[PDB]
Design a binder for this molecule. Structure first.
Ligand SMILES: CC(C)[C@@H](NC(=O)[C@H](CS)NC(=O)CCC[C@H](N)C(=O)O)C(=O)O
Ligand SMILES: [Fe+3]
Length: 329
């Protein structure tokens, strides 16, 4: 038997406004979900997710094997040593079904001082030819800023939920330095579906991606309408319902660190489903040198002995460890 996770739908629209009491009522709902299963759906978010899905499908379904090699990250193309994060993540027919395209802050250009300094985790995005993919780069860059704006509002809700002023997290989430990423993931329908691309969990469930905590402050995720995600609870994994009209939100392990685990990073995994679908996360990452002072809302004085952790170090280590543990995607 597999039970179903409680995933409340939260109208986040007050977080864009100036009704402070309405924002507190949003924050209470975020607090409740964050202390329960860890997930909620953000509704009335203001983003056109139909267009996001349409433009993403047009890209996934028209890009050619030649273009994938040309955009491939270093794990698939030794010529591209500077591409550890941004670029194309190839499928391997017969072995690996998933493929994806990841891009970073569009403000990371050769002029940017973090690029000049060669700081880890900063890279200049790579893009297909405009004539072969008309409008794609423009769509993808505008989406980055659209979901950045939603994420900033959500971070105001999380700050208020934890008893802080609304800019406690958002003040570190800035267009000039954010390490946030978008990933456009295609999970294909395949007939036959190669068993080599299916993992078996300890509890017997067939999986496409194994258990993990997210490497993020929060994760802001759109998926098409195919149920696949599960969250771990003490009584076992529970199914998270799909909703292709909203964004599924959860905290990452940076949030758990800084709240002394008061808002835990939920453990999630991806069930194997033989269905064509999209998984489009935005990982809300701060700047390379961002440090939030840990606290513990459970204590009257909010005191935590946890050491402040620089976001860049957290991200570099977390992305490597996730590849080591759950495979190169
Ligand atoms: C569960 C979804 C969010 C999605 N999983 C994922 O995106 C998984 C687990 S959160 N995330 C990752 O592998 C980290 C990608 C980091 C990215 N290349 C970057 O440089 O910033 C999936 O559908 O598999
Ligand atoms: Fe995850």
């Amino acid at each position: 038997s597999v039970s179903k996770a409680n995933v409340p739908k939260i109208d986040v629209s007050p977080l864009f406004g100036d009704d402070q009491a309405a924002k507190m009522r949003v924050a209470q709902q975020i607090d409740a979900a964050s202390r329960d299963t860890g997930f909620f759906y953000a509704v009335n978010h203001g983003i056109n997710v139909q267009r996001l899905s349409q433009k993403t499908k047009e890209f996934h379904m028209s890009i050619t094997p030649e273009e994938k090699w040309d955009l491939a990250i270093r794990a698939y193309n030794k010529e591209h040593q500077d591409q550890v994060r941004a670029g194309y993540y190839l499928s391997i027919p017969g072995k690996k079904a998933v493929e994806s395209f990841c891009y970073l802050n569009p403000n990371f250009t050769p002029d940017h001082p973090r690029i000049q300094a060669k700081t880890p985790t900063h890279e200049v995005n790579v893009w297909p030819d405009e004539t072969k993919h008309p409008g794609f780069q423009d769509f993808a860059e505008q989406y980055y800023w659209d979901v950045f704006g939603l994420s900033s509002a959500l971070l105001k809700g999380y700050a208020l939920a934890l008893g802080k002023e609304e800019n406690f997290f958002a003040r570190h989430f800035k267009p000039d330095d954010t390490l946030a990423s978008v990933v456009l993931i295609r999970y294909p329908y395949l007939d036959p579906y190669p068993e080599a691309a299916i993992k078996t969990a300890a509890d017997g469930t067939k999986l496409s991606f194994e258990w993990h905590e997210d490497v993020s402050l929060i994760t802001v995720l759109y998926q098409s309408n195919v149920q696949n995600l599960q969250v771990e609870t003490a009584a076992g994994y529970q199914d998270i319902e799909a909703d292709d009209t909203g964004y599924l939100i959860n905290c990452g392990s940076y949030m758990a660190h800084l709240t002394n685990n008061y808002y835990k990073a939920p453990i999630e995994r991806v069930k194997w489903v033989n269905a064509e679908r999209q998984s489009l996360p935005f990982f809300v990452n701060l700047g390379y040198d961002s440090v939030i002072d840990p606290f513990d809302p459970r204590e009257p004085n909010g005191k935590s002995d946890r050491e402040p952790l620089s976001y860049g170090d957290y991200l570099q280590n977390g992305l490597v460890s996730l590849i080591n543990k759950n495979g190169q995607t």
